[PDB]
């Protein structure tokens, strides 16, 4: 069967303005669109399509033996704690800020591990990582906006990344399904206290 969204989780993404998608949508994105707002010219994203791409991304995440091999990256400073609260929780390796090019190809540098998956916050902001992953046969999940490019991305999570809470909500929910996939924690999470660690407050 299909897993249903909690009313707890869908409470988050409306005030995340994750369904407040973008003004422009590509034809690769139109299946993630139920409609567009005729008032603000903003495409509103399907939540049901957003949730099922999360569980496929969670399915692809756990399939590797070690989650620490997965190198998750975010260029912007909005997702700095969104990837920091993620990797303490999921047990992955974080990459924050500018991804140094050649980070997967050049073997003189050994700061991190050789990736078996990468997931990025934005292909616009981390175009260097999604290209460098394709040089080393490494898969790429990505959060992808309505205007964003999706080439060299295996799994698109249709969600907004131009809000400080938005990737903080998305990296939260992607961490929520992961232990739900393992059965480590159910949806009994009480979002009152957890998601604010992912949130970018300054």
């Amino acid at each position: 069967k299909e897993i249903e969204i909690p009313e707890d989780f869908v409470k988050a993404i409306i005030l995340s303005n994750a369904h407040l998608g973008s003004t422009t949508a590509t034809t690769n994105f139109k299946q993630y669109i139920y409609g567009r707002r005729k008032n603000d010219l903003i495409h509103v994203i399907d939540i049901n399509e957003m949730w099922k791409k999360l569980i496929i991304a969670a399915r692809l995440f756990v399939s590797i033996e070690d989650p620490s091999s997965i190198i998750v990256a975010s260029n912007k400073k909005f997702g700095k704690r969104a990837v920091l609260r993620f990797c303490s929780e999921t047990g992955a390796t974080p990459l924050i800020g500018r991804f140094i090019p050649g980070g997967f190809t050049n073997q003189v540098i050994n700061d991190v591990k050789e990736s078996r998956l990468v997931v990025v916050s934005d292909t616009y902001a981390d175009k260097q990582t999604v290209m460098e992953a394709s040089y080393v046969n490494t898969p790429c999940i990505a959060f992808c906006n309505s205007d964003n490019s999706l080439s060299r991305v295996d799994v698109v999570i249709p969600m907004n990344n131009r809000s400080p809470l938005s990737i903080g909500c998305g990296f939260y929910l992607f961490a929520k399904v992961i232990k739900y996939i393992k059965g480590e924690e159910s949806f009994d999470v009480d979002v009152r206290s957890e998601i604010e660690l992912y949130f970018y407050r300054d």
């Binding site: 869908v10 005030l15 409609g35």
Partner: protein, 113 residues
Amino acid sequence: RVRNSNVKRAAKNIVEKYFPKLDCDFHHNKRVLESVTEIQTKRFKNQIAGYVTHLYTRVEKGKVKKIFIKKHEEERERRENMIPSSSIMDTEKIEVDDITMQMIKDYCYRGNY
């Protein structure tokens, strides 16, 4: 004059390894440097210990984004834990605009324009 990478990368390491033993006054800041390093020539000590004070002034303001000090994240995580006014409780009967409610017609709650 402009210091070089032989001085700046050196003085970056001194303030990073040995931050609490330092102070804003230069002559005390040099007195730690003979005690804790081995620098041969006395001019080049003054090159390093001068830039240590030029670092320790702006790391006292916390301006540099590179270096990382044990005291300065434990003070930061106190600032990180904001007493949370998350709007999930603050929003009651959520006003969602006219077409945004129509996509949630299968399973819905808190209906407002």
